[PDB]
Amino acid sequence: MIAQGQTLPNATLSQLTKEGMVHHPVLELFAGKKVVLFAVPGAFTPTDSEAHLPGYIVLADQLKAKGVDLIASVSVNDAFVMKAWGEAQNAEEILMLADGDASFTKALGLEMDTAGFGGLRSQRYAMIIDNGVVTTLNVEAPKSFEVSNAETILAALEHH
Amino acid sequence: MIAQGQTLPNATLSQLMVHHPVLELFAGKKVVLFAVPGAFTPTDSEAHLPGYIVLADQLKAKGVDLIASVSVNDAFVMKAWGEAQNAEEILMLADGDASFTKALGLEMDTAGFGGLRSQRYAMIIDNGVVTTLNVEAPKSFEVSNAETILAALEHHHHHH
């Protein structure tokens, strides 16, 4: 499992935009920025759609007011599902990133097996990333949602 | 791999949360089952699935009792996709870990898009017996569409 102080693996995350499908090198996309990245087990699922992602939508402005250049959600879903999920959630201020084959998630050691529900998915977590180095890392406990929410990240940014 | 004339494997498909066993779901019925590589993808959302929604009543008129769609997605995405598509007449089935698809030998590796997804195909299943199996060639869409399946049922209405 990745830990605070490590650089992100040289992995790719996909996004569907106007020019079309783009494969972002993570170490390029997050270079030189303060990034809040949070992961959900799957788009259109209850906790992610009713609590986790909405929490970051409502606090997006206050997060960026404390120096956050980029807020991004990642899930083990394809980019077409991620785009439709963000439009249904009005997540225009959140960068919706797809880890279709769970390769980025596997490289972080943060995968989990949902068996017949959805195969391999991401654990629920949230990170603060400064120029590619993981500065803070909040990984949820199984079946728990208390440390990866936007309010907890908001308090972490206030610290120093 | 499944072949024309065999029964289906004793697998389950999920719907929103019941785990339909396919040997019991399709028993005593003439079933049209078609598979897509993924919910919310362009071909599946703009051509394949809408083709069966439109021709649904015509298919039922030609003797099919049940029209089902299956994809390697979880049931929450499949339900959200069916509602966005207005597919109340279609039974949207989820094979979230590709177990049903791999049992048929019809899985394909989409790599980073991605993960294991289903090949595009269409089946006519008459009391558990796959009597027509139209598996597309790579990147092809000309044997699994609703019109082809409707055509394969016409000879049942001419008693030679």
Author numbering:
A (entry chain B): 1 to 160
B (entry chain A): 1 to 16, 21 to 164
The authors write:
All three crystal structures of VvPrx3 revealed a protomer exhibiting a compact and spherical structure without a C-terminal extension region, similar to the previously reported 1-Cys Prx AhpE from Mycobacterium tuberculosis. All three crystal structures of VvPrx3 [reduced Prx3 (C48D/C73S), oxidized Prx3 (C73S) and H2O2-bound Prx3 (C48D/C73S)] showed a similar dimeric assembly in the crystals characterized by an A-type dimeric interface, similar to that in AhpE from M. tuberculosis.
To examine the interactions between VvPrx3 and peroxides, the H2O2-bound Prx3 (C48D/C73S) structure was determined at 1.9 Å resolution. A high concentration (500 µM) of H2O2 was incubated with crystals of reduced Prx3 (C48D/C73S), which changed the space group and unit-cell parameters. The H2O2 binding site is fully accessible from the solvent since it is exposed to the external medium. Thus, it is likely that substrate binding near CP is important in the rapid catalysis of VvPrx3. In Prx structures only one O atom of H2O2 near Cys48 (or Asp48 in our structure) makes further interactions with VvPrx3, while the other O atom makess no interaction with H2O2-bound Prx3 (C48D/C73S).
